Amino acid sequence: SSQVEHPAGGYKKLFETVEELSSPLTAHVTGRIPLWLTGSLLRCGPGLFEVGSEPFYHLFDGQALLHKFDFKEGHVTYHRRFIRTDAYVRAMTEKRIVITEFGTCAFPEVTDNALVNIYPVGEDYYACTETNFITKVNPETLETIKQVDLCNYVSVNGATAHPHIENDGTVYNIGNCFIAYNIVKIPPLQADKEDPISKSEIVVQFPCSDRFKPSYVHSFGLTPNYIVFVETPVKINLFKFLSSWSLWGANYMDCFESNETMGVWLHIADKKRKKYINNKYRTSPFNLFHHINTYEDHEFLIVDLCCWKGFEFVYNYLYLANLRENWEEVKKNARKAPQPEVRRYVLPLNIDKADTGKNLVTLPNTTATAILCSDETIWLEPEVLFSGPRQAFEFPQINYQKYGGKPYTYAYGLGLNHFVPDRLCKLNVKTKETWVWQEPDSYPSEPIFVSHPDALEEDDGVVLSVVVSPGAGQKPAYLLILNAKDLSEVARAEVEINIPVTFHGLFKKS
Amino acid sequence: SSQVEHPAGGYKKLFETVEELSSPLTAHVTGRIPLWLTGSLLRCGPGLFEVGSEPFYHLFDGQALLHKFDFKEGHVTYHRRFIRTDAYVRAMTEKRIVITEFGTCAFPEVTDNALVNIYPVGEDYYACTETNFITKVNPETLETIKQVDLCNYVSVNGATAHPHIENDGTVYNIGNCFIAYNIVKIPPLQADKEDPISKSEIVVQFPCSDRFKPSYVHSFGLTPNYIVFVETPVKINLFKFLSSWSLWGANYMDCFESNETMGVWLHIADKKRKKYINNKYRTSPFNLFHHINTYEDHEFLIVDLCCWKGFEFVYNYLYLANLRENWEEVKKNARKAPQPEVRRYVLPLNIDKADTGKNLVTLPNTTATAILCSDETIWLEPEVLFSGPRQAFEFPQINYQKYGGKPYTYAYGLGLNHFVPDRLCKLNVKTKETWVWQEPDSYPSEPIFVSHPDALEEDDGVVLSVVVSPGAGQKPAYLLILNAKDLSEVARAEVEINIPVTFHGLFKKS
Ligand SMILES: OCC[C@@H](O)c1cccc(OCC2CCCCC2)c1
Ligand SMILES: OCC[C@@H](O)c1cccc(OCC2CCCCC2)c1
Ligand SMILES: OCC[C@H](O)c1cccc(OCC2CCCCC2)c1
Ligand SMILES: OCC[C@H](O)c1cccc(OCC2CCCCC2)c1
Ligand SMILES: [Fe+2]
Ligand SMILES: [Fe+2]
Ligand code: NA
Ligand code: NA
């Protein structure tokens, strides 16, 4: 949890327009950047929160800005460029908001504003949002290369900003299909050097709980053998979604609604045999954005999640007008929101009918349960790993390359305090111990883990976070490096310009 | 949680018949019995687990034994006597099992085997089980005085072993009525000196979810202004209950069943105005035996519970044949049981329809939620205070006389390890910090709190527990005194005879 209030309102700098750079800046280092740290921290966020006098309204509307911190021989540079999406290019051409964004209707066509994340496919990098459009970008120069429409390759209406990436480069993702949720597989780059996106295919399909209302999906779980999909009560109303938006004046937010009675349905598919498994896992209602990690343990799936307790859409609390209020009002506004909580669910793969009415979770190290009912629903209860009052452990990251899909011990996260990011956190998922890093008037980003290249342990490395520090008598922002063992500071690299909120990203080793 | 295994099987001594004493024994003190500790620890449990060659089968069937430890000027005595109930007297007369017990059908009439608890009414003390019969006992000599049939005074079929006792001596209890659940109030002793039981009355009534199947009820919550009743999915099948038992060969356990779909319904009544409040609080399924404490906070009720996650009746795992198995088998048998977990529920008293779809728990220091649905059900999620794998914090006690019904910080409990009692625990309900006391091959009882006479703080006092220590090179049992601050040992008082399991009790100051 946080130990800090924010009466000075500095968090408003997260949502203020910035200018791009024409070339990199030096970042001024205090302490010692590790000499084994070589590569680029690439991150995406909104950078332009209005077009002239026309405002963007929602957190997820501002124009995509691609950021890069470079690390070589103890030195750091910072660079950023707006992504030349259709949304951005047409906005600059016509000097107004042209494309409708998540929560901003454009007055007189799907957004490709790739403000959320960036990931590798073959030898390429793509910036993304959650639509059918992804944007190929140059990871060295930050130039925009092209727009890719996933509909030219596979049958989905969109795909999440959180694909899984296996160690050979295979990319898995999930998307709505308008009715199913489809898993897309993009193969690794082959000898022919053809674009792996042209070899995309749907490998498995998950059913939908309601023919006319698919659930919003933000991420999904993956292990060597299984795919996990969590179907929440946050629904997309297709009657509103598919009607003419410029007639009714609609955006994406306007089409969301909450199903009050379904709770959460959890789904598993066999990855290698490409089959849906018809086990009816059921639990109480929550919003889910981020899976933390998923793994197999004696034929139970361990499903660690960042939950929000409630069925109201958490995104209702993320309009910029609310995030820009003063601190007492920010706290007030969050009082009735769903409460964040880290939860471990445990899904049995072997269901014996003879155990009807009993708890199937016979593993020795968990309090999670799964009750087989007579109608064959399997009712689940979680093991809570972390819970604090409006204190969210969010934007989770792990040592992904060596523990993604596997038994693991450690997660890193951004701590939110009534939605305001104000600390960095580490959680031991076995013991429930936590570690916190926090300074007054300092607004960090998602922490990304970088292993020492020769590490044998799980947390032998560092985390990197971009911190906005608007207090006078500090530079406006800095790159923070913490030791992953205990979250103690190793170095920081200060820049002379503001940096807005960033969502997700990656470290690219060179 | 426990840090101890039990391969030697010493816990079997908890379920072995003992003899009563004709007068008190000296208990041999090591350490220092506090000099302010003056009075009697009175506890009940089973003491006779067979009649000749006819065995009792369930944990709750053995014949009531009343135990007393007396404390004066640093010295301790121990005494025990079988309660001369009908069940026990008729068993000794006819040399067989005569009355059907909870899980033992007598072959060729309600049990009054008062093996569970003891409590004060006026100037009297009554041993009890959960039926219509309570047994008046002499707290100094342990002689049995009288059988009292509550049906002579009030309309209930039974009453729990956990009445609440206000500081003036007013007694509240709850019981099934064959359909409602009735709250009984027994007034304090008046100037006329008449038996307060003859002034008993029903003051409020809770409705039942199912006309033909009332829930099992073990305890309930009380505050200065409210009464809280938790209606669980463990049901009593009245078609089986009210049929002829000697025809079918039935006991009480045979009439229980689990309702799979209802979950848990929570209920509130206004204590002083004597009215049921029609708020439909709803959550997922659990067993509940013991409320920890309940209190009011800005017109939310804070409801702290010892839960078991699941709908299967936890009492299925408590047959003596299973509790007497070897340790690996004990662990195996508990794998599919509901998982224990301490949970805080928060119940809003002011429900605004304008907040439909939102979380009503606007208190600043909890993660518990209550979602108002369109059908006006209020769906609850808990804040988990403690959770360990088959590690139950059970038999909760607090500083009851000063903090019962009131804002509080500390609870004490008996720790169960796959149902075997092997440690004592303290929980800070605000911070979730825990303290444990535990020795190898030592089986404690419920801890009971006794305040220091000059206490300033909530935990200024001791806890008393009866510990069974069957390892050779130790005496068979002892009275343990722990400092309530940190659960460090202050003294023990050893006795030269075995003591079986005890359930509940009280400290009587003199
Ligand atoms: O994928 C982007 C993250 C978004 O899903 C999400 C999920 C859960 C909480 C949340 O909070 C938004 C805050 C982030 C930091 C800036 C202030 C608002 C945002
Ligand atoms: O009111 C009497 C206690 C009974 O309700 C109960 C409630 C919850 C767990 C439990 O476990 C039984 C073990 C207690 C210690 C002896 C061994 C069995 C027993
Ligand atoms: O996670 C934050 C919102 C996301 O960036 C976003 C921004 C703009 C449009 C979106 O649309 C989601 C739909 C796309 C089509 C298929 C159904 C989901 C989603
Ligand atoms: O907590 C252990 C079981 C309890 O002592 C017990 C022992 C014997 C008979 C019982 O009967 C419960 C019913 C009484 C009549 C009304 C419905 C409950 C209950
Ligand atoms: Fe995300
Ligand atoms: Fe009890
Ligand atoms: Na600090
Ligand atoms: Na110990």
Side-chain angles (χ1 to χ4, degrees):
Chain A
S1 290
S2 178
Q3 288 170 261
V4 162
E5 307 277 355
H6 304 285
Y11 52 84
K12 293 170 210 189
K13 287 277 173 179
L14 294 169
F15 323 110
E16 188 174 76
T17 292
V18 294
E19 289 188 326
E20 72 190 341
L21 290 163
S22 48
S23 60
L25 296 182
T26 292
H28 309 288
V29 172
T30 67
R32 198 180 172 281
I33 304 296
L35 292 178
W36 52 265
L37 193 61
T38 309
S40 302
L41 176 66
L42 299 168
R43 299 186 56 75
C44 298
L48 178 63
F49 299 88
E50 62 293 314
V51 181
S53 66
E54 287 174 29
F56 287 114
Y57 296 111
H58 204 268
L59 181 60
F60 305 126
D61 295 349
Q63 298 298 292
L65 189 51
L66 179 57
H67 306 259
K68 178 168 64 67
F69 286 93
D70 272 347
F71 302 88
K72 196 179 93 159
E73 295 159 63
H75 289 70
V76 183
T77 70
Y78 175 60
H79 189 29
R80 50 152 182 251
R81 304 292 292 180
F82 286 99
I83 308 187
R84 268 59 178 180
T85 53
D86 288 356
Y88 179 80
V89 160
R90 298 183 64 183
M92 298 306 91
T93 292
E94 302 190 31
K95 305 218 160 153
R96 71 191 185 87
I97 296 174
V98 177
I99 303 285
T100 288
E101 301 292 352
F102 190 67
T104 305
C105 184
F107 300 133
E109 206 140 42
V110 178
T111 184
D112 68 331
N113 176 10
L115 82 160
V116 187
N117 203 6
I118 176 162
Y119 60 94
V121 178
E123 296 171 320
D124 308 310
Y125 286 81
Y126 293 87
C128 69
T129 169
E130 297 177 6
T131 68
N132 60 295
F133 297 122
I134 61 175
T135 304
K136 189 173 164 168
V137 293
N138 184 311
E140 298 192 338
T141 66
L142 314 183
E143 293 170 291
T144 299
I145 295 166
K146 62 167 175 182
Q147 192 196 79
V148 170
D149 181 348
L150 295 172
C151 300
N152 292 355
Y153 301 93
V154 282
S155 200
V156 288
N157 298 74
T160 76
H162 293 293
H164 281 284
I165 317 281
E166 284 174 348
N167 278 333
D168 69 3
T170 303
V171 182
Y172 285 89
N173 210 343
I174 190 172
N176 300 98
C177 184
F178 316 147
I179 181 156
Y181 312 91
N182 296 334
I183 298 290
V184 179
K185 180 179 191 190
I186 306 175
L189 186 64
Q190 262 92 66
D192 64 326
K193 312 291 282 194
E194 298 306 340
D195 173 6
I197 295 170
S198 59
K199 305 186 206 289
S200 290
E201 61 179 79
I202 306 313
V203 295
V204 75
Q205 291 187 289
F206 289 102
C208 190
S209 62
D210 182 321
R211 196 210 283 261
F212 301 121
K213 284 142 185 195
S215 295
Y216 180 67
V217 56
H218 193 81
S219 68
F220 71 105
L222 188 71
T223 73
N225 300 304
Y226 297 95
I227 302 166
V228 178
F229 161 55
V230 179
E231 193 179 19
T232 67
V234 178
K235 296 301 213 168
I236 301 166
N237 192 333
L238 288 182
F239 301 120
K240 304 205 207 82
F241 199 75
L242 300 172
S243 74
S244 66
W245 280 12
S246 32
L247 182 60
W248 288 100
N251 63 35
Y252 298 78
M253 276 297 300
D254 299 316
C255 310
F256 290 90
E257 64 185 31
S258 298
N259 177 314
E260 299 193 11
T261 57
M262 72 173 284
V264 167
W265 294 19
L266 302 87
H267 298 280
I268 59 182
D270 184 321
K271 192 199 98 189
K272 291 169 169 154
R273 303 180 183 79
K274 306 178 169 185
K275 274 205 170 49
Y276 181 64
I277 301 173
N278 189 37
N279 290 349
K280 300 187 169 188
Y281 306 105
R282 298 289 183 275
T283 199
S284 58
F286 56 79
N287 289 219
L288 173 62
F289 306 98
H290 304 114
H291 284 255
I292 303 170
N293 197 24
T294 314
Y295 69 87
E296 299 159 41
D297 182 357
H298 296 78
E299 306 200 323
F300 293 87
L301 294 178
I302 313 313
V303 179
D304 289 347
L305 306 179
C306 293
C307 299
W308 293 84
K309 295 153 65 165
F311 51 68
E312 182 184 21
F313 197 15
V314 171
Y315 286 4
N316 300 349
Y317 296 82
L318 305 179
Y319 282 92
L320 297 172
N322 295 131
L323 299 167
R324 285 162 175 159
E325 294 235 54
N326 290 303
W327 180 236
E328 291 302 322
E329 293 77 13
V330 170
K331 292 191 295 186
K332 205 284 298 305
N333 294 340
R335 292 176 320 147
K336 305 180 192 185
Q339 283 275 4
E341 181 168 287
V342 183
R343 287 181 167 174
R344 166 162 292 185
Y345 289 92
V346 182
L347 280 54
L349 298 171
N350 302 305
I351 315 308
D352 186 352
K353 258 267 184 195
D355 290 322
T356 302
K358 305 190 151 167
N359 169 33
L360 307 182
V361 182
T362 59
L363 293 174
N365 62 320
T366 185
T367 59
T369 56
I371 314 310
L372 184 57
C373 302
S374 291
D375 69 351
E376 313 190 333
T377 55
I378 299 140
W379 178 266
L380 310 180
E381 298 285 325
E383 178 176 2
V384 177
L385 307 180
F386 175 72
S387 197
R390 300 147 187 110
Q391 303 305 297
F393 179 100
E394 261 288 356
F395 295 82
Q397 287 287 313
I398 60 168
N399 179 339
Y400 184 83
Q401 283 169 220
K402 171 163 168 189
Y403 300 79
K406 291 271 173 43
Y408 82 116
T409 313
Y410 307 110
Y412 312 90
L414 177 65
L416 313 179
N417 181 1
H418 302 73
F419 302 114
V420 171
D422 77 359
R423 67 203 179 273
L424 295 164
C425 306
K426 175 185 190 189
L427 169 65
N428 177 321
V429 304
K430 296 175 85 182
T431 66
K432 305 167 179 57
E433 286 164 292
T434 58
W435 293 256
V436 181
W437 184 94
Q438 173 166 62
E439 282 182 1
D441 308 299
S442 299
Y443 308 95
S445 74
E446 172 190 63
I448 283 168
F449 178 82
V450 187
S451 188
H452 189 288
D454 311 311
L456 294 180
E457 318 192 323
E458 184 182 345
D459 57 340
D460 186 4
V462 294
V463 302
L464 315 175
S465 181
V466 184
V467 186
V468 178
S469 53
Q474 259 182 299
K475 299 201 199 301
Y478 58 90
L479 185 111
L480 178 57
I481 311 197
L482 302 184
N483 186 325
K485 290 286 173 190
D486 60 355
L487 297 192
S488 53
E489 182 173 359
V490 167
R492 68 181 73 179
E494 286 173 87
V495 304
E496 285 181 342
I497 54 176
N498 192 39
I499 307 184
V501 65
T502 55
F503 300 128
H504 302 284
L506 60 73
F507 187 77
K508 179 176 176 278
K509 286 155 161 143
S510 67
Chain B
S1 292
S2 183
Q3 288 170 260
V4 162
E5 308 277 357
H6 304 283
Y11 52 83
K12 294 169 210 189
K13 286 278 173 178
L14 295 169
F15 322 110
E16 188 176 83
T17 293
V18 295
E19 288 189 303
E20 73 187 351
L21 291 163
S22 42
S23 58
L25 295 181
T26 294
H28 309 287
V29 174
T30 66
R32 330 178 172 80
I33 303 297
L35 292 179
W36 53 265
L37 194 62
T38 308
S40 302
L41 176 66
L42 299 168
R43 298 184 56 76
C44 300
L48 178 64
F49 299 89
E50 63 294 312
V51 181
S53 64
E54 286 176 20
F56 287 113
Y57 295 112
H58 204 268
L59 180 61
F60 306 125
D61 295 347
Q63 298 298 291
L65 188 51
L66 178 57
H67 306 258
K68 178 167 64 67
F69 286 93
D70 271 351
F71 302 89
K72 197 181 210 281
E73 293 161 3
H75 292 73
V76 183
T77 66
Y78 175 60
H79 191 29
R80 49 153 182 250
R81 303 292 293 179
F82 286 98
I83 308 187
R84 269 58 178 180
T85 54
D86 287 354
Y88 179 79
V89 160
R90 299 184 63 183
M92 298 305 90
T93 295
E94 302 191 26
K95 305 217 160 153
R96 72 191 185 87
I97 296 175
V98 177
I99 303 285
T100 287
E101 301 294 352
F102 190 68
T104 302
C105 184
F107 300 134
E109 206 142 54
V110 178
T111 186
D112 66 334
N113 176 10
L115 81 161
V116 188
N117 204 8
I118 178 162
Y119 60 93
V121 178
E123 296 173 315
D124 309 307
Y125 286 80
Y126 292 88
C128 69
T129 169
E130 296 179 10
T131 66
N132 60 297
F133 297 121
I134 60 175
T135 301
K136 189 174 165 168
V137 292
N138 185 316
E140 299 189 12
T141 67
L142 313 183
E143 294 164 297
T144 298
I145 295 166
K146 178 175 176 182
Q147 190 195 77
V148 170
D149 182 349
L150 294 172
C151 299
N152 292 356
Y153 301 93
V154 281
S155 200
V156 289
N157 297 69
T160 73
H162 294 293
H164 281 283
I165 317 281
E166 284 172 354
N167 278 332
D168 65 2
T170 305
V171 181
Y172 284 85
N173 211 344
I174 189 172
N176 300 102
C177 183
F178 316 147
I179 319 284
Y181 313 90
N182 296 332
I183 299 289
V184 179
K185 180 178 192 190
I186 306 175
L189 186 64
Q190 287 282 98
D192 67 341
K193 312 291 283 194
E194 297 307 302
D195 178 359
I197 294 169
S198 61
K199 305 186 207 289
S200 292
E201 61 184 357
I202 306 312
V203 295
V204 75
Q205 209 142 18
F206 289 101
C208 190
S209 64
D210 181 325
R211 196 209 283 207
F212 302 120
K213 284 143 184 196
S215 293
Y216 180 65
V217 57
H218 193 82
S219 68
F220 71 105
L222 190 69
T223 74
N225 298 305
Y226 297 95
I227 303 166
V228 179
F229 161 56
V230 178
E231 192 179 20
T232 66
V234 178
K235 296 301 213 168
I236 300 166
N237 190 329
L238 289 182
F239 300 122
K240 304 205 206 82
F241 200 74
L242 301 172
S243 67
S244 69
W245 281 13
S246 36
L247 182 60
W248 288 100
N251 64 36
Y252 298 77
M253 276 296 301
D254 297 324
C255 310
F256 291 85
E257 65 186 32
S258 297
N259 176 312
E260 299 192 9
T261 59
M262 71 173 284
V264 166
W265 295 17
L266 301 87
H267 300 279
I268 293 174
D270 184 315
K271 192 199 99 189
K272 291 170 169 153
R273 302 180 183 79
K274 307 178 169 185
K275 54 188 170 49
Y276 181 64
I277 301 174
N278 187 33
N279 290 351
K280 299 187 170 188
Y281 305 104
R282 297 290 182 274
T283 199
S284 336
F286 55 78
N287 291 215
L288 173 61
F289 306 98
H290 303 115
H291 285 252
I292 303 169
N293 195 25
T294 315
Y295 69 89
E296 298 161 41
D297 183 356
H298 296 78
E299 305 201 324
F300 292 87
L301 293 178
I302 313 314
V303 179
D304 287 348
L305 305 178
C306 293
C307 299
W308 293 83
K309 294 152 65 165
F311 52 67
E312 183 183 17
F313 197 13
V314 171
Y315 286 4
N316 299 348
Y317 294 83
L318 305 179
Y319 283 91
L320 297 170
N322 297 316
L323 297 167
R324 284 163 176 158
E325 297 211 63
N326 290 306
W327 180 234
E328 291 300 328
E329 290 84 357
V330 169
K331 291 191 295 186
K332 205 284 298 305
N333 294 335
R335 293 176 319 147
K336 304 180 192 184
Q339 285 274 6
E341 181 168 288
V342 183
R343 287 182 167 174
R344 167 163 292 186
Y345 288 92
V346 181
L347 281 54
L349 297 171
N350 306 314
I351 315 308
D352 188 349
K353 258 267 184 195
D355 290 324
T356 298
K358 303 192 151 167
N359 171 30
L360 307 183
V361 182
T362 60
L363 293 175
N365 295 305
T366 184
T367 59
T369 57
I371 313 311
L372 184 56
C373 302
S374 290
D375 67 353
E376 313 191 310
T377 61
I378 299 140
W379 179 265
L380 309 180
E381 297 282 327
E383 179 174 6
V384 178
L385 306 180
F386 176 70
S387 198
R390 300 147 187 109
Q391 303 306 298
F393 180 102
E394 261 289 358
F395 296 81
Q397 286 289 311
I398 60 168
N399 182 350
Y400 184 81
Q401 283 171 34
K402 294 269 186 207
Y403 299 79
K406 292 270 172 43
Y408 81 116
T409 306
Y410 306 110
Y412 311 91
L414 177 65
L416 313 180
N417 180 1
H418 303 73
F419 302 114
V420 170
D422 78 358
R423 67 203 179 273
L424 294 164
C425 307
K426 175 185 190 187
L427 169 65
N428 177 323
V429 304
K430 297 175 84 182
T431 64
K432 305 166 179 58
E433 181 163 333
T434 57
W435 291 257
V436 182
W437 184 94
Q438 173 165 61
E439 282 183 356
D441 311 300
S442 299
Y443 309 95
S445 78
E446 173 190 65
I448 284 167
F449 180 86
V450 185
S451 178
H452 196 287
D454 313 322
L456 295 179
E457 310 245 81
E458 181 182 341
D459 63 344
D460 279 347
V462 294
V463 301
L464 316 174
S465 180
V466 184
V467 185
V468 179
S469 51
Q474 260 181 294
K475 299 201 199 300
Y478 58 89
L479 185 111
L480 178 56
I481 310 197
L482 302 184
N483 187 327
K485 289 286 173 190
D486 60 354
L487 296 191
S488 60
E489 181 169 352
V490 166
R492 69 182 72 179
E494 286 176 275
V495 304
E496 286 169 286
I497 53 177
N498 194 40
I499 306 183
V501 64
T502 56
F503 300 128
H504 302 285
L506 60 73
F507 188 77
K508 178 177 177 277
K509 287 155 162 142
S510 67

